[PDB]
Amino acid sequence: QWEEARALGRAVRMLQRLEEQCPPSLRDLLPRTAQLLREVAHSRPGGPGGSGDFLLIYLANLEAKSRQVAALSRLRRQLAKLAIIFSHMHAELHALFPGGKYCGHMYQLTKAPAHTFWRESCGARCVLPWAEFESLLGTCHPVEPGCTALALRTTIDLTCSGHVSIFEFDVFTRLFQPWPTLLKNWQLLAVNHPGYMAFLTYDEVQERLQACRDKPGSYIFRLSCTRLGQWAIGYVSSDGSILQTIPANKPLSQVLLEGQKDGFYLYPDGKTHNPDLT
Numbered sequence: 620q621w622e623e624a625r626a627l628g629r630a631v632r633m634l635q636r637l638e639e640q641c642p643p644s645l646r647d648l649l650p651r652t653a654q655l656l657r658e659v660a661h662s663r664p665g666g667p668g669g670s671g672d673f674l675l676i677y678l679a680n681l682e683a684k685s686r687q688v689a690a691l692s693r694l695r696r697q698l699a700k701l702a703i704i705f706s707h708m709h710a711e712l713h714a715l716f717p718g719g720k721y722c723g724h725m726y727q728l729t730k731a732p733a734h735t736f737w738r739e740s741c742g743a744r745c746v747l748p749w750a751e752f753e754s755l756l757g758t759c760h761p762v763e764p765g766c767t768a769l770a771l772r773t774t775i776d777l778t779c780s781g782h783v784s785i786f787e788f789d790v791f792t793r794l795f796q797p798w799p800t801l802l803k804n805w806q807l808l809a810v811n812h813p814g815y816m817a818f819l820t821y822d823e824v825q826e827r828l829q830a831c832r833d834k835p836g837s838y839i840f841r842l843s844c845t846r847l848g849q850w851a852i853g854y855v856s857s858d859g860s861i862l863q864t865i866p867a868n869k870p871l872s873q874v875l876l877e878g879q880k881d882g883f884y885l886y887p888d889g890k891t892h893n894p895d896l897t
């Protein structure tokens with residue numbers, strides 16, 4: 620209430636400080652996040668998992684990750700990773716508090732069945748702890764206990780807070796549509812497919828595909844910080860030049876099958892074996 624206002628205040632001063640101490644770049648993200656937080660502070664509880672609980676979890680997590688950055692190739696390997704995480708935290712804040720104003724209670728998921736699943740399972744809540752989320756999901760899509768779950772957390776919990784927000788669920792269900800085979804799609808595209816690069820930049824995809832330039836049909840697919848919930852495919856055309864496609868709001872496996880049948884997507888990461896997706 621006033622606890623929230625105070626924690627909002629601490630957060631912004633903490634970000635300004637972290638900025639002094641310094642794509643996706645922390646120099647661009649830090650002040651953007653600080654500005655959004657002042658707008659949030661200015662515009663300002665809900666039930667459990669409402670705007671208040673969300674802010675509390677968000678601010679603790681922002682704090683924890685800020686300490687990790689402050690206490691800092693393999694140094695650059697870990698700064699890059701923290702930088703992606705801050706990008707993710709800025710996007711989540713932006714989606715649930717556009718212009719500082721909480722919209723979590725009426726936020727609309729892009730895929731209709733994902734929408735229905737979330738609102739029927741969580742009601743007005745915009746955020747849920749991993750354990751509850753995993754359990755609720757499991758009533759609809761069997762999640763195997765053990766290591767599968769760890770890989771699934773990494774895919775879904777973008778902000779690495781141990782909580783899944785409605786935004787992260789939206790991102791995940793867009794990427795791995797259609798709903799009826801949700802986890803199966805995730806398993807085929809993100810666990811078992813050598814074409815999958817997770818988060819890359821355009822430049823990194825270019826760099827990666829250089830060694831495949833004399834092999835047209837070589838391709839890869841990646842996620843993008845500033846375009847959460849969509850794919851990009853990098854591929855070698857017959858000319859040997861690296862092009863990028865952004866697939867429509869439609870299943871990735873369909874785009875890849877159609878591109879396999881056209882001769883564009885044949886060699887994931889240069890490799891000869893192209894997984895059967897039929």
Ligand SMILES: [Ca+2]
Binds near residue numbers: 777779781784
């Ligand atoms: Ca999270």
